[PDB]
Ligand binder design. Structure first.
Ligand SMILES: CCCCCCCC/C=C\CCCCCCCC(=O)OC[C@H](O)CO
Ligand SMILES: CCCCCCCC/C=C\CCCCCCCC(=O)OC[C@H](O)CO
Ligand SMILES: CCCCCCCC/C=C\CCCCCCCC(=O)OC[C@H](O)CO
Ligand SMILES: *C/C=C(C)/C=C/C=C(C)/C=C/C1=C(C)CCCC1(C)C
Ligand SMILES: CCCCCCCC/C=C\CCCCCCCC(=O)O
Ligand SMILES: CCCCCCCC/C=C\CCCCCCCC(=O)O
Ligand SMILES: CCCCCCCC/C=C\CCCCCCCC(=O)O
Ligand SMILES: CCCCCCCC/C=C\CCCCCCCC(=O)O
Ligand SMILES: CCCCCCCC/C=C\CCCCCCCC(=O)O
Ligand SMILES: CCCCCCCC/C=C\CCCCCCCC(=O)O
Ligand SMILES: [Br-]
Ligand SMILES: [Br-]
Ligand SMILES: [Br-]
Ligand SMILES: [Br-]
Ligand SMILES: [Br-]
Length: 262
């Protein structure tokens, strides 16, 4: 009842488009899961955790998207020409809770292919995860107010954005100070990964703000469309680039299975 999805009836076209976005998301992540599983054998031990983390992200995101899809069809029934709310079973909050797990995985696989190790890896991962969790938690509290108190959504969103900015500064600083350690030409690739991240992750706060500028049923559809673009870009496309970097550095480091695969 705290999310705008509960306020509207949906046309068949709107309802089925949202359902198809979510189900397509499930298929894309589980298809990618198999790809990451099969190619892990071509990654040197030093980097193989990075590809395993992509497997974990795929199933984590795939399970939440599948949960959202079933919750969506549980919550609404087609009555008198529109889909109308029947049960309080759908909310976006499950995405936020899941981010607590998937964002640390996405960040860790970046740090691994940057060749960080030992105390710097543990220290950098700790500050990044704390910053990320602060961002997620404040965002989560903010969206509890997207119906009742838009001013509170904005203020919690400003606090969240402060964590986001600091997180991105840590990430960017480590990338630009360590890309010279990267093998096989991937010092060039990692810069593109950073820009892909900036683009894809910024779509989430845009989705967060939809209630402020498009509080209607088409805004609900737009938000799910933005989440879909962002999810595929931040998890699947990002994971493919991380895996490419891992295999390329593995080969440059003399790992034979990587050399043959390329
Ligand atoms: C009264 C309400 C409370 C107000 C306060 C809440 C807002 C504070 C937010 C950010 C400050 C913390 C930023 C400090 C981060 C420094 C540590 C760090 O980033 O280390 C990175 C390094 O590159 C890795 O080794
Ligand atoms: C809540 C409202 C507050 C609004 C606040 C607006 C300030 C935005 C500024 C920067 C965004 C952070 C982007 C981080 C980009 C990476 C920066 C970086 O990596 O620095 C390069 C390094 O110094 C080379 O060695
Ligand atoms: C969802 C689509 C996944 C299928 C193909 C993506 C291929 C993109 C290439 C990503 C880098 C991995 C790579 O090039 O090496 C793997 C090779 O297939 C070792 O047999
Ligand atoms: C796969 C999911 C990912 C990469 C989720 C990323 C989420 C964010 C970057 C969220 C950022 C937010 C803000 C910067 C302010 C508004 C609240 C959030 C949590 C949506
Ligand atoms: C190889 C693997 C390919 C991808 C595997 C995905 C398999 C099917 C996904 C099932 C999602 C169906 C959810 C429907 C819920 C609903 O809308 O009611
Ligand atoms: C589609 C189902 C799975 C295909 C992956 C199994 C084939 C293993 C190939 C690995 C190799 O070439 O050594
Ligand atoms: C309060 C929350 C703090 C969370 C901190 C999490 C710390 C995680 C630290 C690094 C995990 C990396 C483990 C795998 C190392 C891979 C390196 C390698 O095998 O080449
Ligand atoms: C359990 C999750 C781990 C918590 C540790 C991470 C700490 C990060 C920043 C805390 C942000 C505090 C915001 C809580 C206030 C919300 C409220 O009381 O309404
Ligand atoms: C760490 C968290 C940092 C500070 C969070 C401040 C935002 C609190 C807004 C409360 C709005 C209200 O209840 O009146
Ligand atoms: C996620 C990015 C957050 C950006 C910070 C928000 C910037 C705030 C800008 C002006 C706030 C104006 C407050 C007006 C409250 C409207 C109350 C209402 O109409 O219900
Ligand atoms: Br229709
Ligand atoms: Br329509
Ligand atoms: Br190795
Ligand atoms: Br997720
Ligand atoms: Br490149």
């Amino acid at each position: 009842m705290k999310n705008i999805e509960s306020l509207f009836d949906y046309s068949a076209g709107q309802f089925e488009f949202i359902d198809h976005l979510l189900t397509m998301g499930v298929g894309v992540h589980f298809a990618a899961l198999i790809f990451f599983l099969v190619v892990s054998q071509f990654v040197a031990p030093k980097y193989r955790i990075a590809t395993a983390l992509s497997c974990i992200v795929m199933v984590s995101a795939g399970l939440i998207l599948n949960s959202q899809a079933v919750m969506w069809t549980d919550a609404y029934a087609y009555v008198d020409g529109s889909y109308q709310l029947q049960d309080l079973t759908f909310s976006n909050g499950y995405r936020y809770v899941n981010w607590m797990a998937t964002i640390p995985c996405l960040l860790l696989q970046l740090l691994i292919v940057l060749n960080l190790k030992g105390k710097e890896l543990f220290s950098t991962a700790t500050w990044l995860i704390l910053a990320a969790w602060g961002m997620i938690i404040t965002g989560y509290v903010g969206q509890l107010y997207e119906v009742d108190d838009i001013a509170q959504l904005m203020i919690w969103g400003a606090v969240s954005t402060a964590f986001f900015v600091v997180m991105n500064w840590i990430v960017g600083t480590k990338i630009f100070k360590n890309r010279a350690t990267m093998l096989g030409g991937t010092d060039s690739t990692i810069t593109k990964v950073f820009w892909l991240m900036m683009f894809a992750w910024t779509l989430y706060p845009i989705a967060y703000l939809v209630p402020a500028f498009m509080n209607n049923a088409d805004g609900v559809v737009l938000r799910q469309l933005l989440f879909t673009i962002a999810d595929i870009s931040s998890k699947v496309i990002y994971g493919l680039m991380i895996t490419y970097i891992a295999i390329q550095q593995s080969a440059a480091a003399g790992y034979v299975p990587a050399q043959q695969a390329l």
